[PDB]
């Protein structure tokens, strides 16, 4: 069936829209090359629609089956608990979509009668009937990039009122149940150092390695009724309370499988027989999927020894080489059941034979060494798109902080290290807000963070060599180099002078500030001072952090105010 059926009706915004960076002092001191930044709009989003809109021929087989019923057997040792309407209201981010019936987040977080009632009402009308469809409202995502134009991204999401129900009912499934099926193979369960060290492992761990990734192209679009069918036969595997079982049945036919499109102004725009971007189950669903497709292509294939990490659509296969020309032909092999399997190549696949030479989550390994001289593994990425984002976020208030998640995510690479952490925290101490939280996203959960905190947040995510790294490799100062000059960034002398200024003027503060000057500003200087393990950070709650990906799910994970 098609993807999308469209009636013509435009995808429209619900407010003015900048594509442009503008020409702002802060973000120009960060990024002089502005004209090279822009930011997606509805503008584009008809080139989006015709590239998201196909046919899908699926054609399953016994080895798929076979790695269903393998799944489904593991997915029968859950039990999941039913959400509470106050433990699903505290879930909702503080700035999530208004729902159309009268009341926002802030009315949900409250637990105010209104959304209370309204609530209740969506969850009796889930238990009650299992066959309307549940309107959704499709916008174009606003998101910043760097040129070479990129069209906008669509979403697809129902009213705040299911949105609280999908918590109810699922929320205790998509967190528990990806890594009771998948295992070691589910990505969302690590922090950056255990990712790292899972990859690092595995790829050690076979005698002669290769892997690969996988990019399926518009996965969510490729995603059949029959996947999204075959996804709740695995959450029904679950031990569940009668009115979480019904809630998933219809959930599942009334908006997983597909459903109406409405636009921002209430005009019916199309039909989606395909995965909805801005549900609960998006991310466990689409891991769940793409890890039996691949699991199954594998088999078929006959790769040997297959160790997949997977995260939503994002997979890498790591496996025993069985020889340059057969491993060429196995991949293609496993590409031709991919896409039998409703899973075609975006990027044709190739096999690679060093580990730092595999992009997977967008990131690659790289080594650096601590104070000791000791080698360490560690994720890093290409620089460009977050110095593109943190300098929109510098010259605009975004209600997602991407530069915080990307230090938080990113602290041992050399540049989050000299230009990130340098550039905010200037800014930062200039306007008396070290200590304001900020909202950023981990795994797609938004958390409430404030700087000062960072330096225990980074030990526990990487431990204390993220704050000593220094020989990098060539092949990574070079292509922090060049991004540089591409985006117009001051050179990195220019970050050691502003860190070594930023970091007397924390260590001035004392407190949390010069433990920031300290920790995260110690590479800028000769005169190292001490590093010892902080005490804050095996304090640290970082319980519900590494557990589950919940991208498009509207889940806020830092703790709610008592009233
Ligand atoms: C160890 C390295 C370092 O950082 C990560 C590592 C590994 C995986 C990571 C992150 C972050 C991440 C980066 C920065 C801020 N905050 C974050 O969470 C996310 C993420 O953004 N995931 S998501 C798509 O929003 O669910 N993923 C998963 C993910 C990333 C993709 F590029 C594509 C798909 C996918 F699954």
């Given at each position: 069936?098609?993807?999308?059926?469209?009636?013509?009706?435009?995808?429209?915004?619900?407010?003015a829209?900048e594509?442009?960076?503008?020409?702002?002092?802060?973000?120009?001191?960060?990024?002089?090359?502005?004209?090279?930044?822009?930011?997606?709009?509805?503008?584009?989003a008809?080139?989006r629609?015709?590239?998201?809109?196909?046919?899908?021929?699926?054609?399953?087989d016994?080895h798929?089956?076979?790695?269903?019923?393998?799944m489904?057997?593991?997915?029968?040792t859950?039990?999941?608990?039913?959400l509470?309407?106050?433990?699903?209201?505290?879930?909702?981010?503080?700035?999530?979509?208004?729902?159309?019936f009268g009341?926002?987040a802030?009315?949900?977080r409250?637990?105010?009668?209104?959304?209370?009632?309204?609530?209740?009402?969506?969850?009796?009308?889930?238990l009650?009937?299992?066959?309307?469809?549940?309107?959704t409202?499709?916008?174009?995502?606003?998101?910043?990039?760097?040129?070479?134009?990129?069209?906008?991204?669509?979403?697809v999401?129902?009213?705040?009122?299911?949105?609280?129900?999908?918590?109810?009912?699922?929320?205790?499934?998509?967190?528990?149940?990806?890594?009771?099926?998948?295992?070691?193979?589910?990505?969302?369960?690590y922090?950056?150092?255990?990712?790292?060290?899972?990859?690092?492992?595995?790829?050690?761990?076979?005698?002669?390695?290769?892997?690969?990734?996988?990019?399926?192209?518009?996965?969510?679009?490729?995603?059949?009724?029959?996947?999204?069918?075959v996804?709740?036969?695995?959450y029904?595997?679950?031990?569940?309370?009668?009115?979480?079982?019904?809630?998933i049945?219809?959930?599942?036919?009334?908006?997983?499988?597909?459903?109406?499109?409405?636009?921002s102004?209430?005009?019916?725009?199309?039909?989606?027989?395909?995965?909805?971007?801005?549900?609960?189950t998006?991310?466990?669903?689409?891991t769940?999927?793409?890890y039996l497709?691949?699991?199954?292509?594998?088999?078929?294939?006959?790769?040997?020894?297959?160790?997949?990490?997977?995260?939503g659509?994002?997979?890498?296969?790591?496996?025993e080489?069985?020889?340059?020309?057969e491993?060429?032909?196995?991949?293609?092999?496993?590409?031709?059941?991919?896409?039998?399997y409703?899973?075609?190549?975006?990027?044709?696949?190739?096999?690679?034979?060093?580990?730092?030479?595999?992009?997977?989550?967008?990131?690659?390994?790289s080594?650096?060494?601590?104070?000791?001289?000791?080698?360490?593994?560690?994720?890093?990425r290409?620089p460009?798109?977050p110095?593109?984002?943190?300098?929109?976020?510098?010259?605009?208030?975004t209600?997602?902080?991407?530069w915080?998640?990307?230090?938080?995510?990113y602290?041992?690479?050399?540049?989050?290290?000299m230009?990130?952490?340098?550039?905010?925290?200037?800014?930062?101490?200039?306007?008396?807000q070290?200590?304001?939280?900020?909202d950023?996203?981990?795994?797609?959960?938004?958390?409430?963070?404030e700087?000062?905190?960072?330096?225990?947040?980074?030990?526990?995510?990487?431990g204390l060599?993220?704050?000593?790294?220094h020989?990098?490799?060539?092949?990574?100062?070079?292509?922090?180099?060049?991004?540089?000059?591409?985006?117009?960034?001051?050179?990195?002398?220019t970050?050691?002078?502003?860190?070594?200024?930023?970091?007397?003027?924390?260590?001035?503060?004392?407190?949390?500030?010069?433990?920031?000057?300290?920790y995260?500003?110690?590479?800028?200087?000769?005169?190292?001072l001490?590093?010892?393990?902080?005490?804050?950070?095996?304090q640290?709650?970082?319980?519900?952090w590494?557990?589950?990906?919940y991208?498009?799910?509207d889940?806020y994970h830092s703790?709610?105010?008592?009233?």
């Amino acid at each position: 069936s098609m993807s999308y059926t469209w009636t013509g009706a435009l995808i429209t915004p619900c407010a003015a829209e900048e594509s442009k960076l503008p020409i702002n002092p802060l973000s120009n001191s960060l990024l002089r090359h502005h004209n090279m930044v822009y930011a997606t709009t509805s503008r584009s989003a008809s080139l989006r629609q015709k590239k998201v809109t196909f046919d899908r021929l699926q054609v399953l087989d016994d080895h798929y089956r076979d790695v269903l019923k393998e799944m489904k057997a593991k997915a029968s040792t859950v039990k999941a608990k039913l959400l509470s309407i106050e433990e699903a209201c505290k879930l909702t981010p503080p700035h999530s979509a208004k729902s159309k019936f009268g009341y926002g987040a802030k009315d949900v977080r409250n637990l105010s009668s209104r959304a209370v009632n309204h609530i209740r009402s969506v969850w009796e009308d889930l238990l009650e009937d299992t066959e309307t469809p549940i309107d959704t409202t499709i916008m174009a995502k606003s998101e910043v990039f760097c040129v070479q134009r990129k069209p906008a991204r669509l979403i697809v999401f129902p009213d705040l009122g299911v949105r609280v129900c999908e918590k109810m009912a699922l929320y205790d499934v998509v967190s528990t149940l990806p890594q009771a099926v998948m295992g070691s193979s589910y990505g969302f369960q690590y922090s950056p150092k255990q990712r790292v060290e899972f990859l690092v492992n595995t790829w050690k761990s076979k005698k002669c390695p290769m892997g690969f990734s996988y990019d399926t192209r518009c996965f969510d679009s490729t995603v059949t009724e029959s996947d999204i069918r075959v996804e709740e036969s695995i959450y029904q595997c679950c031990d569940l309370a009668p009115e979480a079982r019904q809630a998933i049945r219809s959930l599942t036919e009334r908006l997983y499988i597909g459903g109406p499109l409405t636009n921002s102004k209430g005009q019916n725009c199309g039909y989606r027989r395909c995965r909805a971007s801005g549900v609960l189950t998006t991310s466990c669903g689409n891991t769940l999927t793409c890890y039996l497709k691949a699991t199954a292509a594998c088999r078929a294939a006959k790769l040997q020894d297959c160790t997949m990490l997977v995260n939503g659509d994002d997979l890498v296969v790591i496996c025993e080489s069985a020889g340059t020309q057969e491993d060429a032909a196995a991949l293609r092999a496993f590409t031709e059941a991919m896409t039998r399997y409703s899973a075609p190549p975006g990027d044709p696949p190739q096999p690679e034979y060093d580990l730092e030479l595999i992009t997977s989550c967008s990131s690659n390994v790289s080594v650096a060494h601590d104070a000791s001289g000791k080698r360490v593994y560690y994720l890093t990425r290409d620089p460009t798109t977050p110095l593109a984002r943190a300098a929109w976020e510098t010259a605009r208030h975004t209600p997602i902080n991407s530069w915080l998640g990307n230090i938080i995510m990113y602290a041992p690479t050399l540049w989050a290290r000299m230009i990130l952490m340098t550039h905010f925290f200037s800014i930062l101490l200039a306007q008396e807000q070290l200590g304001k939280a900020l909202d950023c996203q981990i795994y797609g959960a938004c958390y409430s963070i404030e700087p000062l905190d960072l330096p225990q947040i980074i030990e526990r995510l990487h431990g204390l060599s993220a704050f000593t790294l220094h020989s990098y490799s060539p092949g990574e100062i070079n292509r922090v180099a060049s991004c540089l000059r591409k985006l117009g960034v001051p050179p990195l002398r220019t970050w050691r002078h502003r860190a070594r200024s930023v970091r007397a003027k924390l260590l001035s503060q004392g407190g949390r500030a010069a433990i920031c000057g300290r920790y995260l500003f110690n590479w800028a200087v000769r005169t190292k001072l001490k590093l010892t393990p902080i005490p804050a950070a095996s304090q640290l709650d970082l319980s519900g952090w590494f557990v589950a990906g919940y991208s498009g799910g509207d889940i806020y994970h830092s703790l709610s105010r008592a009233r």
